[PDB]
Subunit: 99 residues, 2 copies
């Protein structure tokens, strides 16, 4: 699709056997979800850095469906007001900025 | 142009008589620059909200050239590690997400 930016670019996600929403965020390097229970191995990751760091769980090679596109990428699990699709997964669905 | 997302989408800016760089950030509602001296009227704006609020100067209808495109939009002036082009100005240059 082509998504204009007059509104926040929120899209539908299938992840961890659940239906979720997430923000397509070109300003984010990484992808973050809260309230998902992902299977398999994880390792801790420190992110943020302003005011302190936040410790999240890093899951590698997570299957995820983003707006109908079944792809694979790293997903961080930790607190976030809106789930975020970062560049690491936008590259996987072939998403570009165009003007 | 078409900008892929394997790297951070940094572009060249002309603003306030200066040459700057800024991040095209679809996760940001607003546009923020530091170290610019903009002419004309401004009003205070509270943004952020995590850990407290940050007070910035809001300048309306600022002429700004983004990657060769001369447009107009609100620019906030305050501290930011990288200058940010938010959705308010990406709409002005006709920028969309495509996949």
């Amino acid at each position: 699709p082509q998504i204009t930016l007059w509104k926040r670019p929120i899209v539908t996600i299938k992840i961890g056997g659940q239906l979720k929403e997430a923000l397509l965020n070109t300003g984010a390097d990484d992808t973050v979800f809260e309230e998902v229970n992902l299977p398999g191995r994880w390792k801790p990751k420190l992110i943020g850095g302003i005011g302190g760091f936040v410790k999240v769980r890093q899951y590698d090679q997570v299957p995820i469906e983003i707006c109908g596109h079944k792809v694979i990428g790293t997903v961080l699990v930790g607190p976030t007001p809106t789930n975020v699709i970062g560049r690491n997964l936008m590259t996987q669905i072939g998403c570009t900025l165009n003007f």
